[PDB]
Amino acid sequence: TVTVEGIPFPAEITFTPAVSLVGNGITDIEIHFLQIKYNAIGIYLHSNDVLLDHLHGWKGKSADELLGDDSFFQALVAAPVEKLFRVVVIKEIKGSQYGVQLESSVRDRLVAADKYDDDEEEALEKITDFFQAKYFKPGSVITFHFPATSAAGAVEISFATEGKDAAKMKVENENVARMIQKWYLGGDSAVSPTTVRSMADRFAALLSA
């Protein structure tokens, strides 16, 4: 177990497999010299040899070298491995506020690669409508499940607030999926650089022995 801002995070989220925690951090912002800690993020990954193969070209590098190498994080996004994003809400916000932030971030990454048409638009609409109904209480846990291959499942976006049961939603438009993946696992472009620095120190270890 590992605590982030007093929020416990499991070392391994099995029963999903064997995804292991590789990065920890928070989503924050500074408005008028004041830190606003929104979320607590934990990135889980399955440590198969497929990962150590797709990341072998970065073996022996340092955390400061992986951090400046935005291609290492793109190769990490493009790994065919079960992934899990565990975002725990810290500050009470409307679920729509996180929805318009997920849309605008993914839409911009979609327009950059020209991969924005109508198939991506509806898959983005199904996500915004999913979050605008729920309200983020300090304890709610959004969960992104990225299976290893497109054969097994698709992409499961789970919600877990205290009281009600786990509200889940499936998306299969892989364009929006691997842009949400870039939103959390990107280099200098990710939403939580604190989570990125944690992956750098972790991967720099495995990718050294």
Numbering used by the authors: 7 to 22, 27 to 219
Can I see the authors' text?
Chalcone synthase (CHS) and chalcone isomerase (CHI) catalyze the first two committed steps of the flavonoid pathway that plays a pivotal role in the growth and reproduction of land plants, including UV protection, pigmentation, symbiotic nitrogen fixation, and pathogen resistance. Based on the obtained X-ray crystal structures of CHS, CHI, and chalcone isomerase-like protein (CHIL) from the same monocotyledon, Panicum virgatum, along with the results of the steady-state kinetics, spectroscopic/thermodynamic analyses, intermolecular interactions, and their effect on each catalytic step are proposed. The production of these value-added products also offers the prospect of increasing the value of the crop, especially because many of these compounds are soluble and readily extracted. This study characterized the enzymes involved in the first two committed steps of the flavonoid pathway, CHS and CHI, and the non-catalytic protein CHIL. Through crystal structure, molecular docking, mutagenesis, kinetic analyses, ITC, and FRET analysis, our study provides evidence supporting a revised catalytic reaction mechanism for monocot CHS and CHI and identified an intermolecular interaction of CHS with both CHI and CHIL in a non-competitive manner.
The electron densities corresponding to the residues from 6 to 21 and from 26 to 219 among each of the 223 residues in the native PvCHIL molecule were resolved. The overall secondary structure was composed of eight β-sheets and seven α-helices. The structure of PvCHIL was very similar to that of PvCHI in terms of both the number of secondary structural elements and the overall three-dimensional structure with a backbone RMSD of 1.21 Å. The area of the largest structural differences between PvCHI and PvCHIL was located at the residues corresponding to the ligand-binding pockets of CHI. However, the corresponding primary sequence for those secondary structural features is not conserved, as the active site is replaced in PvCHIL with the following residues: Arg-35 (Thr-37), Thr-47 (Asn-49), Asn-113 (Ser-115), Ser-190 (Trp-193) with Tyr-106 (Tyr-108) as the only conserved active site residue. Close inspection of the results indicated that the PvCHIL utilized its unique protruding loop between β3a and β3b to bind near the homodimer interface of PvCHS. The interaction between PvCHS and PvCHIL was endothermic with ΔH of 31.88 kcal mol−1, ΔS of 127 cal mol−1 deg−1, and Kd of 76.3 µM. In the presence of naringenin and naringenin chalcone, the Kd was 7.46 µM and 170.35 µM, respectively, indicating that in the presence of naringenin, affinity between PvCHIL and PvCHS is increased, whereas affinity between them is decreased in the presence of naringenin chalcone. As previously observed in snapdragon (Antirrhinum majus) CHS, promiscuity of PvCHS was rectified by PvCHIL, yielding much less CTAL and BNY.
